[PDB]
Structure 1
Amino acid sequence: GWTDPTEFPLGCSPNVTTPKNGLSMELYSYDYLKSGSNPCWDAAYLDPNYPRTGYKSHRLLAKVENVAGNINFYYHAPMGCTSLFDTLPQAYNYRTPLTMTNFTMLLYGYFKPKVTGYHTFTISADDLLFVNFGAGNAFDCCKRESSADDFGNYQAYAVWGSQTAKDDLTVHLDAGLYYPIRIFFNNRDNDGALSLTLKTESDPNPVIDFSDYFYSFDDTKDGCPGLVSY
């Protein structure tokens, strides 16, 4: 299947004149239910289609470009079932306070490896992190806008409180190619947390700063299929 997740994901070969650093981000509201409710949080985030089209029924907070660096955070909420304003880490390029206790966040763009070989991406989240990776699975090469909602089965997924609250994906990548990536996050209530790390054989320690790895590219009419193949 075109959008199915694989160990040998498809990469892309855009024209790399003045390449845009970082991923794109969209932030959406995630309102609580009526004050005093039990459960207090909106349960929409667990709906299979919330990450596909459901979030679009919420309020658009911002579109942001150039998301790059260490995107990991643990936000400790002072009180539960309470909307509280605070700030994202510097990497998100978004300085104004938002409801860190309850929000939806979409990131997309391309991952560029440094060293050809196996890559293990490990994720954890509070509440939810769904990752697509590779052309088709995330979106089509330089045809993101037209394929944005057609992402396939997740490469990795983590849901707080579920039987899979931490996950990983192992993929063989070529350093010459750029791999479509989609990261969907939700905090329903209280603490919020996102951890993405990368392990390869070239470094005994994990990579947590993705400054040099995340890119954005304009769509083109014909697309930009990968020009390295084995």
Structure 2
Amino acid sequence: TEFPLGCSPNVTTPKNGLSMELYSYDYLKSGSNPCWDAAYLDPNYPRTGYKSHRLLAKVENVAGNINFYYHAPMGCTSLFDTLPQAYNYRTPLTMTNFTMLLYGYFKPKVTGYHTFTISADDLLFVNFGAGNAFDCCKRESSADDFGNYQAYAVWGSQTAKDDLTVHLDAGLYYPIRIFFNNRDNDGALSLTLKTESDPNPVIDFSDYFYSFDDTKDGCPGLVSYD
């Protein structure tokens, strides 16, 4: 979808950052082969399966550079460490093995083609646009109804759709859903943005990520090109 749908909330002062939910991703019982839980590859794990795991936290105002590489001291071992400051989550968690969901809206600074590139260890699935991620100012009621991933990356796969190239309007806020899993060992998440008019890739999304309350009527985008 080259021209994803955006949204036009009625809001004077939009809330900065995305929402985040963290969930457990336990290893299998010691002695299993392989050591890691394979659930993360199930088509419905990112839709409702993660809800069968333990909720670790719901966090707000996630903004900044969300990229990280975590080097596990050893494999098949649950080890504790911390996320980058952008995640607004300061306490140690099992960086070797966890599930993370981010959602909210992306606001472009300049109208035009935007290329988002992703890489992950182990898994990063991205939905982008109204409908595809969720409905405009109707997130809660459409939360589990996201469509085909606009980008996806899975460690060890002949993966692909490591990028998404879309025409965006600076006047709209675009629903975005980012689903991450580390099954074991090293963990890594990279999201970057390249615009056609700007020479430097963007890695700090401080000014681009927003959250909005849902409304009875919704807030469909008021920019259209056909």
TM-score range, shorter chain: over 0.9
174-183 or 32-41: bigger deviation: 32-41
Deviations 1:130-184 (A, max 9, x none): 0000000000000000000000000000000011167100000000000000000
Give how far 1:37 is off: 2.3
On the 8 A contact 1:159/1:166 being kept in 2, the answer is no
178-187 or 159-168: bigger deviation: 159-168
On the 8 A contact 1:73/1:89 being kept in 2, the answer is yes
SS in 1 for 2:86: helix
TM norm structure 2: 0.98
Question: In 2, distance between residues paired with 1:201 and 1:50?
Answer: 35
Give how far 1:204 is off: 1.1
Match of 1:146 in 2: 141
Q: Which one of the candidate residues 164, 170, 186 is aligned to 1:169? A: 164
On the 8 A contact 2:7/2:174 being kept in 1, the answer is yes
On the 8 A contact 1:25/1:106 being kept in 2, the answer is yes
- Indicate how the Cα distance of structure 1 residues 188 and 166 shifts in structure 2: closer, same or farther if over 3 A, else same: farther
Deviations 1:43-67 (A, max 9, x none): 0000000000000000000000000
Deviations 1:17-41 (A, max 9, x none): 2210000000000000012322000
SS in 2 for 1:198: strand
Give how far 1:15 is off: 1.5
Structure 1 vs Structure 2 CA RMSD: 0.8
Question: In 2, distance between residues paired with 1:97 and 1:125?
Answer: 21
- Indicate how the Cα distance of structure 1 residues 166 and 89 shifts in structure 2: closer, same or farther if over 3 A, else same: farther
Give how far 1:225 is off: 0.5
55-64 or 15-24: bigger deviation: 15-24
Question: In 2, distance between residues paired with 1:180 and 1:213?
Answer: 12
Q: Which consecutive residues of structure 2, in runs of 5 or more, have no partner in the other structure?
A: none
TM norm structure 1: 0.96
Give the percent of matched residue pairs that are identical in Structure 1 and Structure 2: 100
Deviations 1:92-144 (A, max 9, x none): 00001000000000000000000000000000000000000000000000000
Match of 2:52 in 1: 57
On the 8 A contact 2:150/2:161 being kept in 1, the answer is no
On the 8 A contact 2:116/2:192 being kept in 1, the answer is yes
Give how far 1:14 is off: 0.4
Q: Which consecutive residues of structure 1, in runs of 5 or more, have no partner in the other structure?
A: 1-5
**Which stretches of structure 1, 4 residues or more, deviate above 3 A after TM superposition?**
none
